[PDB]
Amino acid sequence: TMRIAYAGLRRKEEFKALAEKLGFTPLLFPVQATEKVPVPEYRDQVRELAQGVDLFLATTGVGVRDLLEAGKALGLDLEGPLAKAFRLARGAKAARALKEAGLPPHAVGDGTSKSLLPLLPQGRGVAALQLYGKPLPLLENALAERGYRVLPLMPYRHLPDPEGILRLEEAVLRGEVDALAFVAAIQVEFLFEGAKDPKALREALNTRVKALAVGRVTADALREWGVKPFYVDETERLGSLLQGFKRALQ
């Protein structure tokens, strides 16, 4: 044998080593670019945050930490404004980061943007939305619906690897791969947004090539593109997906 393509970037050497040990032929087809691009307005947005906001929404633990570090690098007091804000955490990791900063959240979702919808207050003012490398339109528009002016805090843009996506699509369509492992929802997005033939690609991943998802969020992204995942690891570990996929196959 099974040729398994990995759409990931970070753990590609770990994936290769473990796949080989489990009797697979690993293939590395990252769909994200190594380069992040800074968001020019970000420093200005953190300075605005420092002026006080009504809501603060945290999406990731790493994102929370990085925002707090950015406030320090800029010589600002963020903990004061954040202490006064009504704070939401999208999931436990965002929540844990807030708690560790002395800023425990007032509401926590289940790790999905959608789980925050019922938790959002109606009101007026500024809602600061912590992001890292990707916009969250469902949540951003939901905030505007609720009456709030949205202040994005996205330091970077995650970028696709356009030629790499095209190569991966060809490999899938030409039968060079038996399975394709996705470890983040953004990899699914990049691939289907970058595909020359997204209808053919969907068909292949439904009929010929097994789409493997590490995590429910990744699996939901496949489903939104009309792809039924062959295997979903809800342990959310790459190692576990590979062992679990081996059994599912037989």
Ligand X SMILES: O=C(O)CCC1=C(CC(=O)O)c2cc3[nH]c(cc4nc(cc5[nH]c(cc1n2)c(CC(=O)O)c5CCC(=O)O)C(CCC(=O)O)=C4CC(=O)O)c(CC(=O)O)c3CCC(=O)O
Number of residues located near ligand X, criterion CB under 6 A: 21
**Residue 8 binds to ligand X (criterion: CB under 6 A):** yes
Q: Other C-beta atoms within 10 Å of 144: how many?
A: 12
Closer to ligand X by CB, 183 or 222: give it. 183
- C-beta of residue 158 within 8 angstroms of C-beta of residue 60: no
Site for ligand X in 94-113 (CB under 6 A): 94
Residue type, position 39, single letter? V
- The residue range among 44-52, 76-84, 130-138, 173-181 that interacts with ligand X, by the rule CB under 6 A, is 130-138
214: β partners = 233
CA atoms of 194 and 163, how far apart (whole Å): 9
Site for ligand X in 144-173 (CB under 6 A): 158
Site for ligand X in 29-58 (CB under 6 A): none
CA atoms of 166 and 175, how far apart (whole Å): 14
| DSSP for residue 140 | H
Structure tokens, 92: 């436990």
Q: Binder to ligand X among 24, 56, 132, 192 (CB under 6 A)?
A: 132
Q: Binder to ligand X among 126, 185, 212, 213 (CB under 6 A)?
A: 185
Tracing tokens 């429910």 back to the chain, one arrives at 216
- C-beta of residue 187 within 8 angstroms of C-beta of residue 166: no
- The residue range among 8-16, 143-151, 160-168, 199-207 that interacts with ligand X, by the rule CB under 6 A, is 8-16
**Residue 241 binds to ligand X (criterion: CB under 6 A):** no
Q: Binder to ligand X among 4, 9, 129, 219 (CB under 6 A)?
A: 9
**Residue 60 binds to ligand X (criterion: CB under 6 A):** yes
Closer to ligand X by CB, 203 or 236: give it. 236
CA atoms of 45 and 102, how far apart (whole Å): 22
Closer to ligand X by CB, 52 or 239: give it. 239
Q: Binder to ligand X among 10, 84, 149, 228 (CB under 6 A)?
A: 10
What backbone torsions phi and psi does residue 107 show, to the nearest 5 degrees? -145, 145
Closer to ligand X by CB, 51 or 189: give it. 189
∠ CA(114), CA(115), CA(116), 5° rounding? 90
* Residue in 66, 71, 64 with CA at minimum distance from that of residue 48: 71
Q: Binder to ligand X among 217, 223, 239, 248 (CB under 6 A)?
A: 217
Binding site for ligand X (CB under 6 A): 8-11, 59-63, 93-94, 131-134, 158, 183-186, 217
